[PDB]
Each structure stands twice: as structure tokens, then as C-alpha cells.
Amino acid sequence: QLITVDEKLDITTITGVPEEHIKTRKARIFVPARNNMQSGVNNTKKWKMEFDTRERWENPLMGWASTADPLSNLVLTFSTKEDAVAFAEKNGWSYDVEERKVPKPKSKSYGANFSWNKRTRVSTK
């Protein structure tokens, strides 16, 4: 048989995460921008959750980039904005959500290149 639990899901005390990395962190929920160096759009399909960037410093011995931030590389993939927000609520993280940016539909016309009287006429092919 089932019971009624009338609370918002909250699992921060059973996840093992240290206090510091629950309430000082800022999650960002966004759809990654297309890498403008390429035309492919397959990396703009899913929602991502990432946390705020913290200090990286130079190792004295070798000069490598050191970190004391356990969440520096943590990136989560979600199907929808709602799924990402629900995951952040129940984990106690403060988050900022950013609307998905879809390219606008463009009116393309090859024949515009040869206009009789418009400025769209091209001077070279």
C-alpha cells in the first residue's frame, strides 16, 4: 500500500555531497551554442547542466593547471528544460535557466542573385 508524502522532493542529505558544494554553487541550465567554426547542429539538440567556474592555478613543480573544485568537469545532459530544473531542485542547487536559441527561418532564393532592379544582385559567382 502507498502513502501520501506532501513535500517537494529534497535529497541533499542523502547524496553525500559536502555542504559547501550544494549552496555556494550555481548551476547553469542551457542548450549549448553551435560551435561557430562548423555548420553541424547535432551538438545543439540536448540540454546541459554545468556549474560555475572556480579557480585554476599553476602547479609549482610542472606548471600544470591545478584545481580544488570537485565539480569543475561535471556536466549533465537532459532531454528537456523541465528535466534539468527538476534535477536541480531535488539536489538543492541554485540554478539559472536560459531559453533555447533556435535559428530563425530564412527566405532563400537563388534567383535573387540576378535581380533586375534590386540590390541583392551579386557582382560575382
Binding site: 502513502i3 501520501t4 508524502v5 542529505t13 572556480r54 579557480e55
Partner: protein, 114 residues
């Protein structure tokens, strides 16, 4: 809001389990100090036990409470059977960790962490 329970139907049953676990831990501290040969006193051990219970005093979900009690009991079984070592028992006391400031100005001087 209808969900499958773990052990407790409601928060009053859950708090009964929480009180029972607190008694088991309270009784155990004198033995743990003896078996593991700790240089802390029994009061210190019991104060630490109390501290760990109070960090979770704000839970209102019986399923979450049921899990904390479940984890607390495994934690206790590790101690009684001496599966833990002295190092594991003393990790609760963070002896080698320096105190991190909580005020704004002290954080400001050391670095960028909020």
C-alpha cells in the same frame, strides 16, 4: 503524491526510528572509545553523535528519514564490529583540517570562493 514507503508510513513512525538509533549510538560511544583506544573523551564522542543528528533536524519526508536511519545503522554496525579502523572513526573530527572562515572579509582575503 502517492509513493511507496520504505519503513515508516508517516513522520511520527519515522521519529520513533530516529530516537531508537540515537539510543544505540549513545550506548555505543563508551565502547567505541575503549575498543579503538581514542584520545577523545566519551562526552566528545556523544557530542559528535548529537552534532550529526542535528544537521538533519529539518527533514520532513519520512522516506528521507528512513534512509538516513538506514545509513546510520550501517554506520553503527561498521563501528561495533570493528570493521572501521581508528582512522575511519576519527574522520568525523577533521583534526588535520584548518578552520575555514565564514565571514565575508576573511573569505575575501584568501581567494575567490563565495
Amino acid at each position: 503524491t502517492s509513493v511507496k514507503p520504505i519503513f515508516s508510513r508517516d513522520m511520527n513512525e519515522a521519529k520513533r526510528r530516529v530516537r531508537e538509533l540515537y539510543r544505540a549510538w549513545y550506548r555505543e560511544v563508551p565502547n567505541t572509545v575503549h575498543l579503538f583506544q581514542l584520545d577523545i573523551s566519551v562526552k566528545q564522542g556523544r557530542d559528535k553523535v548529537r552534532e550529526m543528528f542535528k544537521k538533519n533536524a529539518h527533514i520532513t519526508d519520512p522516506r528521507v528519514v528512513d534512509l538516513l536511519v538506514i545509513k546510520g545503522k550501517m554506520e553503527l554496525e561498521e563501528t561495533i564490529k570493528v570493521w572501521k579502523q581508528r582512522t575511519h572513526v576519527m574522520r568525523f573530527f577533521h583534526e588535520t583540517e584548518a578552520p575555514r572562515p565564514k565571514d565575508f572579509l576573511s573569505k575575501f582575503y584568501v581567494g575567490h570562493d563565495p
